[PDB]
């Protein structure tokens, strides 16, 4: 399976994927690229593509969405004021032909933060609830701990 | 072999899901084939084909990393988006094995620019200091194309540069010294303690020693602080290594302007230090040689020359041959000049084509250079005339017309004169235009004109515009110096052929009508002896050095 | 920095069966096999480890149907040449596993321009030791 990870610079990509290939908590520099790494969750290996989310990298997802299988949009819930940014870099995602019935799953992360917005709300504000078109999940994660990991790699592998 | 469409495109696969290592290095394989075979890529094909190869990289097989080398250097500049292959070529560049070491150095720094100079520093200093010549000589490259991005960085690894300089290993050193020199250059001084260390010292490394002598080469005494020497005690001025390049290079600066002086057993102002390698096989061409020497070329060119001449004389083969005459003319000076002239006359005999133009060229450029009296350059320039007939060309008009009018004019128009006798119409536009200038000019009361006109009036009747126009304005002038001339002016002009051609004609009507018709104030301002259109150096002794012994 | 100003291994004709330029005086198609024809003409039909073109010393050998070059300076001489030149066509061989001919260069196009990369750099000798290009290639 072939997984495509995005989001806004610092919502906890590559913490996510290194957690899940290492069982460890990295120190993660500024993913200026993407890392790409393979991944064993009961019998699937997912292919994961981490791809920067700054905003000269922003700029090149759109050479990732090709043979997308499923998108994992990482979220920090404790930023609120990128909250929108990020739901209008997801909403013309959704636009994208590539990624047209891609399995979407957003990780509203750093849930372990007090004044971390619930995955509710999250869900309220990236406009999940209107998308008719294919499969959607949210899923509350904190990447340190590994909570809500495994439930994400399990929705995605039911696709 | 390939068709260079159909495999840029097909490598669009990588750039989504597919990685196959196996088919995209063939499909890397074909793009270099394409450059190889001689082929241009297409520029969208190219961008796409660059991003989807990144992709690959992730995949880490030894053939498939080198292809990928390869594939972005030749694809960098006909590609976009190309710095995400930066990340991966850090990622290959750090795995320990030369396949990737020393090509991901050469790749990433060539696709390196300012702003990732800083990147590959920590991974370019642990590559640097190698004394595995592949993993350090491609660091030592790679930071020289890195100076241009940024200076700085490259700078800091002057340390580590010069910790590959120690090494007698001869890659390791020629490119850690050369690269030095070029690197912490700020002032000729901090470079000039980088060769002082090095310089005492008897390498065992030819290339290094090549590249330092020409560092080198120059009086340097303020190596490493100072020094009461230009000393170079490394084979510039010494011979501690003989090996017939290194040696001739060292031997031709050192003798007239000390790199240091000569030693007992390093020549180094005497003229041996070439000729004791000067008997060998075809390593000789090095060795025979010369140039400067003490205190001319000459006491040396006697060593050496049993060598030079047998094979210049015997070989008709054109490869020794040619190093025959380059040693030849490098044995030579003002003195050697009467042997350079035989055999020079001689060589011909053996490639006789252009190399015959270029040997009656050569005994005219010889006696111009090196002076055997100016008389018998023009005496070589007639044997010129003579032999080719038409490889003199127009710019020999002009430069046999402005030479010879420096002494010779009288002399020349009269050769000429005879020489025009040849052949009629395949002798060309030149010589017609050479006989009909310095006849139009000199206006011969040497010999009578009526031999050179009657000569000249039968060349233009079928031989090029550029002459029977010439033919017109000359006789016009001729007219104008000389009024003696008129009579025959007159009966050449109305001729179909020096006037009532096409080019001919309309200069003609001009030159004619001012002549005929018009006061000749203008006709006699004109003639200020009936020189030639320009004046030029003296064009063909220079001409004639490099092309004998190609 | 600078020794090699090319490489070319050429068939018998001059025509490019290969040419890797570790100058920047030839990258078009055109001029490329310009100055193969160029070289294989005065160097080939006389084997000598100097020929004299363009004011550069070239070295140069031959096989069966095919004549390698390396051209370099002319303040050298063919030793120092002849060496990148011995690793030329020792290095294709050994690489190839096959000796230098047309057929094996053709039999291996990927062997032979990886093996002439890692001999010259850009016309510094980068290598000029067979065994060492050989393992550092990876066919």
Redesign the interface.
């Given at each position: 399976m072939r997984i495509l990870m995005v989001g806004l610079d610092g919502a906890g990509k590559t913490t996510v994927l290194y957690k899940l290939k290492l069982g460890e908590v990295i120190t993660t520099i500024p993913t200026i690229g993407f890392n790409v790494e393979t991944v064993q969750y009961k019998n699937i290996s997912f292919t994961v593509w981490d791809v920067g989310g700054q905003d000269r990298i922003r700029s090149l997802w759109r050479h990732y969405y090709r043979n997308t299988e499923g998108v994992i949009f990482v979220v920090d819930s404790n930023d609120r004021s990128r909250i929108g940014e990020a739901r209008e870099v997801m909403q013309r995602m959704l636009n994208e032909d590539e990624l047209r019935n891609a399995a979407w799953l957003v990780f509203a992360n750093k849930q372990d933060l007090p004044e971390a917005m619930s995955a509710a709300e999250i869900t309220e504000k990236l406009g999940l609830h209107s998308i008719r078109n294919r499969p959607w999940f949210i899923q509350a994660t904190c990447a340190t701990s590994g909570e809500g990991l495994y439930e994400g790699l399990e929705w995605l592998s039911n696709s | 072999h390939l068709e260079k469409s159909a495999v840029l495109q097909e490598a669009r696969v990588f750039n989504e899901t597919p990685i196959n290592p196996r088919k995209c290095a063939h499909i890397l394989t074909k793009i270099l084939y394409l450059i190889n075979q001689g082929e241009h890529l297409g520029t969208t094909e190219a961008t796409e084909a660059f991003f989807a190869m990144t992709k690959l990289f992730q995949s880490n097989d030894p053939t498939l990393r080198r292809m990928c080398y390869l594939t972005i250097k030749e694809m960098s500049c006909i590609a976009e988006d190309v710095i995400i292959v930066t990340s991966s070529l850090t990622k290959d560049m750090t795995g320990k094995e030369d396949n990737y070491r020393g090509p991901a150095v050469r790749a990433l720094c060539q696709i390196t620019d300012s702003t990732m100079l800083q990147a590959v520093e920590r991974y370019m200093k642990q590559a640097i200091v190698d004394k595995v010549p592949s993993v350090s000589s491609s660091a030592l490259v790679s930071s020289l194309h890195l100076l241009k991005c940024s200076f700085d960085v490259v700078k800091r690894w002057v340390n580590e540069a010069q910790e590959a300089a120690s090494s007698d290993n001869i890659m390791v050193q020629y490119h850690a010294l050369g690269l030095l020199y070029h690197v912490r250059k700020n002032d000729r001084l901090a470079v000039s303690k980088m060769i002082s260390k090095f310089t005492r010292h008897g390498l065992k490394s030819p290339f290094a020693y090549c590249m330092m002598i020409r560092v080198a080469s120059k009086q340097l005494e303020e190596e490493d602080g100072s020094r009461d020497s230009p000393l170079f005690d490394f084979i510039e001025s010494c011979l501690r290594n003989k090996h017939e390049m290194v040696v001739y290079e060292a031997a031709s600066a050192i003798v007239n302007l000390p790199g240091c002086s000569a030693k007992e057993l390093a020549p180094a102002v005497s003229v041996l230090q070439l000729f004791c390698s000067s008997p060998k096989a075809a390593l000789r061409y090095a060795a025979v040689r010369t140039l400067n020497k003490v205190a001319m070329k000459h006491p040396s060119a006697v060593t050496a020359c049993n060598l030079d001449l047998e094979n210049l004389v015997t070989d008709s083969n054109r490869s020794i041959a040619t190093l025959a005459i380059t040693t030849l003319l490098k044995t030579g000076s003002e003195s050697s000049i009467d042997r350079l002239m035989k055999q020079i006359s001689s060589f011909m005999s053996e490639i006789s084509d252009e190399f015959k133009v270029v040997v009656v060229q050569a005994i005219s450029a010889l006696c111009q250079k090196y002076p055997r009296k100016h008389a018998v350059l023009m005496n070589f320039l007639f044997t010129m005339l003579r032999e080719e007939g038409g490889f003199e060309y127009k710019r020999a008009i002009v430069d046999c017309i402005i030479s010879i009018i420096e002494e010779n004019s009288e002399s020349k128009e009269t050769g000429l004169s005879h020489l025009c006798e040849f052949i009629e119409d395949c002798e060309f536009t030149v010589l017609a235009t050479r006989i009909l200038h310095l006849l139009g000019q000199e206006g011969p009361k040497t010999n009578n004109p009526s031999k050179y006109i009657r000569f000249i009036y039968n060349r233009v009747v079928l031989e090029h515009e550029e002459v029977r126009a010439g033919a017109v304005s000359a006789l016009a002038k001729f007219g104008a110096q000389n009024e003696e001339m008129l009579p025959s002016i007159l009966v050449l002009l109305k001729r179909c052929v020096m006037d009532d051609d096409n080019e001919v004609r309309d200069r003609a009507t001009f030159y004619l009508n001012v002549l005929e018709q018009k006061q000749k104030a203008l006709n006699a301002g004109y003639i200020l002896n009936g020189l030639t259109v320009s004046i030029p150096g003296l064009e063909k002794a220079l001409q004639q050095y490099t092309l004998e012994p190609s | 920095?600078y020794?090699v100003k090319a490489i070319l291994i050429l068939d018998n004709d001059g025509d490019?069966l290969?040419?890797?330029y570790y100058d920047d005086t030839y990258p078009?198609?055109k001029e490329?096999?310009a100055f193969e024809k160029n070289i294989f003409n005065?160097?080939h039909r006389?084997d000598?480890?100097?020929?004299?073109?363009?004011?550069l010393?070239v070295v140069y050998k031959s096989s069966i149907d095919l004549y390698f070059y390396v051209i370099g300076s002319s303040?050298?001489?063919?030793?120092?040449l002849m060496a990148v030149l011995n690793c030329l066509f020792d290095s294709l061989s050994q690489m190839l596993r096959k000796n230098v001919e047309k057929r094996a260069l053709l039999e291996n196009?990927?062997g032979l321009?990886?093996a002439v990369?890692?001999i010259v750099?850009?016309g510094?000798?980068?290598?000029?030791?067979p065994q060492?290009v050989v393992?550092?290639?990876?066919?």
């Open positions: - | - | 920095l020794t490019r290969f040419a890797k078009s198609v490329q096999k005065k160097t006389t000598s480890e100097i020929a004299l073109l363009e004011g010393t303040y050298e001489n063919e030793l120092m196009m990927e321009f990886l990369d890692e750099d850009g510094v000798i980068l290598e000029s030791d060492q393992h550092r290639v990876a066919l």
